[PDB]
Design a protein around this ligand. Sequence first.
Ligand SMILES: Nc1ncnc2c1ncn2[C@@H]1O[C@H](COP(=O)(O)OP(=O)(O)OP(=O)(O)O)[C@@H](O)[C@H]1O
Ligand SMILES: Nc1ncnc2c1ncn2[C@@H]1O[C@H](COP(=O)(O)OP(=O)(O)OP(=O)(O)O)[C@@H](O)[C@H]1O
Ligand SMILES: [Zn+2]
Ligand SMILES: [Zn+2]
Lengths: 675, 675
Amino acid sequence: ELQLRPYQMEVAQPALDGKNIIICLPTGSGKTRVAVYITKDHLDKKKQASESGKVIVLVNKVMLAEQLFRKEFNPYLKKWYRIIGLSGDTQLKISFPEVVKSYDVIISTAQILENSLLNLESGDDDGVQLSDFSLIIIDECHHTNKEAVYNNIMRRYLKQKLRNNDLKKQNKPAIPLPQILGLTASPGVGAAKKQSEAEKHILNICANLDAFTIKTVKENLGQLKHQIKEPCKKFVIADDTRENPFKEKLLEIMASIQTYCQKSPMSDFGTQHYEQWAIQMEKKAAKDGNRKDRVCAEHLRKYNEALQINDTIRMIDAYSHLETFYTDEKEKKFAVLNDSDETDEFLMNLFFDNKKMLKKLAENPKEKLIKLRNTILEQFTRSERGIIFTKTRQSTYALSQWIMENAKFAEVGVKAHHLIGAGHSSEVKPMTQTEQKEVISKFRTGEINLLIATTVAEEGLDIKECNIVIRYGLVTNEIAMVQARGRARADESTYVLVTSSGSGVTEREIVNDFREKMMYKAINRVQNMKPEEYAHKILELQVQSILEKKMKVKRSIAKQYNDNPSLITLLCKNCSMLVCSGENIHVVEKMHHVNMTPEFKGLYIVRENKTNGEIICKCGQAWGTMMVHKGLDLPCLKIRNFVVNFKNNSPKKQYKKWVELPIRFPDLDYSEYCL
Amino acid sequence: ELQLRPYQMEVAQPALDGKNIIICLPTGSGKTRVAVYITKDHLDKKKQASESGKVIVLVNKVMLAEQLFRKEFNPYLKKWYRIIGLSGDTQLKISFPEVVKSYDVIISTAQILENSLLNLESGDDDGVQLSDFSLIIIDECHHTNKEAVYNNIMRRYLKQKLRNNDLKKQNKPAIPLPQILGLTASPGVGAAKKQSEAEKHILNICANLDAFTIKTVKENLGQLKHQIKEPCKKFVIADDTRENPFKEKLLEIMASIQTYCQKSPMSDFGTQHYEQWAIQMEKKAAKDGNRKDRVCAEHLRKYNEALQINDTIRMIDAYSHLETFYTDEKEKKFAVLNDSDETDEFLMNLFFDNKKMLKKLAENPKEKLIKLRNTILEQFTRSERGIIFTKTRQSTYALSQWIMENAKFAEVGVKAHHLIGAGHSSEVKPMTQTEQKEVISKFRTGEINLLIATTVAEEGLDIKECNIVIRYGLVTNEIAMVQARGRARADESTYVLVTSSGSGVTEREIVNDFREKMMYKAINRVQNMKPEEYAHKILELQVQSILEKKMKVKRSIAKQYNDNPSLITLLCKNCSMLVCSGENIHVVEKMHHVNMTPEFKGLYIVRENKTNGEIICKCGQAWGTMMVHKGLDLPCLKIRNFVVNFKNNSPKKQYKKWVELPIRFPDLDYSEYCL
RNA sequence: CAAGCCGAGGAGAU
RNA sequence: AUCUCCUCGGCUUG
RNA sequence: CAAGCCGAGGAGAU
RNA sequence: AUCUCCUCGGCUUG
Ligand SMILES: Nc1ncnc2c1ncn2[C@@H]1O[C@H](COP(=O)(O)OP(=O)(O)OP(=O)(O)O)[C@@H](O)[C@H]1O
Ligand SMILES: Nc1ncnc2c1ncn2[C@@H]1O[C@H](COP(=O)(O)OP(=O)(O)OP(=O)(O)O)[C@@H](O)[C@H]1O
Ligand SMILES: [Zn+2]
Ligand SMILES: [Zn+2]
């Protein structure tokens, strides 16, 4: 039943017989079907060869593993051989080492295999070796980078390959090495200005992947051009001339607070440099133990980010963010007072006094939003799907709120939903993988006609067809832009970019376009190179990478060696008071820290407002949570909100992290808490 | 919205229609607005001409490019056309060749364009040609000199122009050449005594720029005289009669050390000739391999420079400099001994024994500083900005320390800060471009009322208004003086010069004044000349310059031809011992050198005190650093601290430089370091 | 469904 | 090399 | 933020 | 033509 096409033959013909190589075709070129066909051919050759045929497929994203399991690999290969799809979300509840030798076909994230090999080296588990495999297939090869996961696996493979070469000169016996295949569309450039450097980056990629070729289509390219239609390019610009009243009022309060705290701005307002200066002032205040330097800095930061989003988000969202922050602060203050400095009262009373007028001033008119609405609605009328790319998740939420609230979209009847990434990213609600999964399914079937997504959807997150692809103030790198452009896969596509004229964004878009042109100019060059000098370059890059990794591991071992028991005193950053000693702390689960002595309980204050409570200091500085672990409600504390004081010279140092502290703490002896 | 003035029309009228010319107006005459208006007119003519309009602007300084991008060009031209500002600091991260044909307006440093053209000639990159442009504009035309960057570009242009002329006689087709405009205020004189030679220099400038005219204002000159007010000239002199005690003690130790090392001074003390003699003795000691000749010479040099600054700097700074130098020497000696000649002990013990008495003798009183303070404070009281020009950066630092420490300035409340140049200049901390940028911004907005700067601020570094301009022992050339004088741009200005009466400095100031007078006397002359003989002179100078450049390139190619693999033996200059062979050395990044054999590791000693360590010899002579490159911590060595010994005739030669050695070294073969 | 931990990648400013 | 901002994967607990 | 490399310009003395 | 002292730009590495 398997079906194929000419360009697929031409690209995949070399790999049919050895030739561990890479393949670079645009999106929607059937690369997945190429891969399944190649795997089938390899397994057939093994069977007719009376040799063990093992195939492993590696994908950076978890979803794509199940996607290939459901759509391409299993349907076209179910009957001939045994197949399985692994992932972190999925329970590989047997084990990796033997399922490698139980199904002959593995589809798993690279991290699982990497963990298995590390376990083997540690000797804790029997583990697995690459020799057990006969064919490795890697999707999204462009991620093979300085020390990415793919790069780690390939560095192990290349060390084995160098050992085998050395033996070939020394001893005939050698460890067999499985074939390697790579799939990609935009290999990318490591920020190379000279085309020579771009080719150097391409050769580095090839050496990491041991491809020895690229094998891009050259004969039937016309057929691909006919089948694939590139979206029409559209540029959109804007200027922030309006917004004068409320911006002016906010800047007036800005200047007032600054002069009150006498902060030299050392930079222009509304920029990342100012935030960095604010953080430097935070650190200085920590090293000095004074107030009036950090609360003001955080408030300035909140105002700055509010202003930044205002240029790209409606003022209502910024006002709500600020109000929520101040309400949380006031709840903190009320709790601390309930248990029972002038600048804090100044800030809160300033905001309270001007709260009503600020609300009235923000509610009034005086935007990219109006023109975005114009473009989207006129396009929808002309069409009778849609994707938005932005910077931060709350921007996606604001866009969803805007499209729901406005009645014009309801008149059009366009369906929309907000999609974002997972995990915790500094005050953005983590999103569950399953939730993203039903969102993508709902969009796939048709109910959602508009999908708002962050960089996650830029890569992978494959869809059959997306008619409209519009980016909104998001330009990062050539790979992101090109993959977003190719994600349309529609017969007729509209690629739009929206941003501010003052900001350097259109320049970035054209830079990515030139990077694509340069990628072609370099890929065609490398495809035409002398085999001897070529292989020489691959060897040089391989050996250099292996050596660099070896020195890096040596310096990682040599960097962390102190591990002293107790040589410090931990204080509260906000109020320089002795909070804990260097030994009273105890470790649990080899990851968390806690203080158990009741003397510590007599210092801090417990607070809960909302299923684990949080801790606060006498000065209102948040410390941690009340972890419920194996019965015990242990008070876990975050070093992110503390200060250190060594026993000698008292050099104050803030780490925002535990491992960055070279000295280790003792584990929790439950026997110390008997009765 | 664009606005203009009559003299601007009169000067710029000829350029409106061809007439590749130059313009010479004083500072703050709106030359920038003249340039933007001319560019706008040219682009409009191209548009109505249905022809491609390309404009490129060249500036020697990096900052001025962004300055024109922010203040003059973009604000007045944003809407009509597309604009961009390039620089080394800025990432032209697309490429030069196509951004030339992407925005129609380029503002970049000349070096970038020069590099692009050299790349084109080499054929490595597609590159760019001047034909792609339609109008070239050059600021600071006075820098078009013997083989400056502007001169290189103009020499290429003039070779093309001569080819086009030859074809015009031979073949009608010819490569079109963009118009050329030059902007300046003080074209300058190439040290001409006869007014005929001054006019010759002016004609050389014009020929390099192909100006064919000067077009200085002659009609509305009265209006410029009214609008611009020249600063009042002030001379100040001083004598070093005082300072007898500590100077006498220093000269006593001077004589003691000299007699101990029996050095014929061959010159007077406290002069550059003595330093040159000391360096000659250094070289002789290198050619003989003896001690007691270089350490003493360096100590004498340090004493000499200390004395020189004492005439213009407080003794505390000189004492601190000497103490730091000797502490560094002693740390070196302690390290070398830690691993485990009588004159060195003599020097160190002499300084140690007299250290306390020297400190006590320097602390006592017995200066230009007191009168400088008097003048500055009385002027500040009279005024109810300020700029200081000096020789060396540490002088600026000393001035900042003096103004901060003294309480009288605090009573006045004058704000001050030290500004200096960037880069490494033999034991002066390099300064970052961004740092200079925020310094200039802070002064511009008002917080800094006093800006101490070196020759960098003399040229460019434009400021709206600088009330006070005072120079402190700095007279170099007529251009520096005139530009510093015009940099005031204040309605009322005070130009002051301070220096020693004995030194020949007031003479230099009046020489620069006469040079300005002579520049006018020659510019008015050249503006009135016969067109035929004029063009003849321009042609003669152009052809002469092109021919000279051609012979220079021929002799540069013919000079470096040996490039032998290994014919020498490298020894330590201080101790004549075999340090390395002619082949054991290896090259990396095509710029650095290193020795990898452990036998070399068994010879030198590693030292680190402070993120790269340094190397020292068994005799305490510093050699290089431990470069951390692409993983490897390769030991990089500086030929500046070594001696050479050829395999024949053993002629010792010190180069202070690698390229000056005609023989080349092999690159680093990483394969030689496997495992 | 929530919390925590470990590593990695990309962009922007020093 | 440092700081900031975003994103991915793996592990643990409830 | 630090280090290194390449060229160029100016001043002073032989 | 040589030596010394200052300044500019470009490139690379971390
Ligand atoms: N040989 C083929 N004949 C017909 N259609 C094909 C063939 N190969 C692939 N396709 C089309 O490919 C579409 C799926 O594209 P697919 O996901 O395989 O592309 P891709 O290049 O792997 O994508 P991406 O770059 O997003 O990972 C299917 O709708 C099918 O129509
Ligand atoms: N046509 C004009 N009308 C009014 N003011 C003008 C005009 N042209 C220039 N100016 C004044 O010029 C000042 C800026 O001077 P500018 O930097 O252009 O001088 P410049 O001659 O280029 O300087 P420099 O010699 O330092 O490079 C502005 O403050 C503006 O007041
Ligand atoms: Zn506290
Ligand atoms: Zn030595």
